[PDB]
Each structure stands twice: as structure tokens, then as C-alpha cells.
Design a protein around this ligand. Structure first.
Ligand SMILES: [Zn+2]
Length: 27
């Protein structure tokens, strides 16, 4: 998918990698 939080704005590939990442912006 894609990130859009803070200055991280990283890149997401799929749902698994989607939450496995944004999980921080969420905690
Ligand atoms: Zn991010």
C-alpha cells in the first residue's frame, strides 16, 4: 500500500506489510 503518517511516510507492499508497519503510527 503506502504510508502517510509523520515524517516516516514509508512504502507498504501488502496488508501483512501494511499493518506490520503502520502499527507504530498506531502503537
Ligand atoms: Zn510509516
Amino acid at each position: 500500500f503506502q504510508c502517510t503518517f509523520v515524517c516516516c511516510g514509508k512504502r507498504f507492499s501488502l496488508d501483512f506489510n501494511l499493518k506490520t508497519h503502520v502499527k507504530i503510527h498506531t502503537g
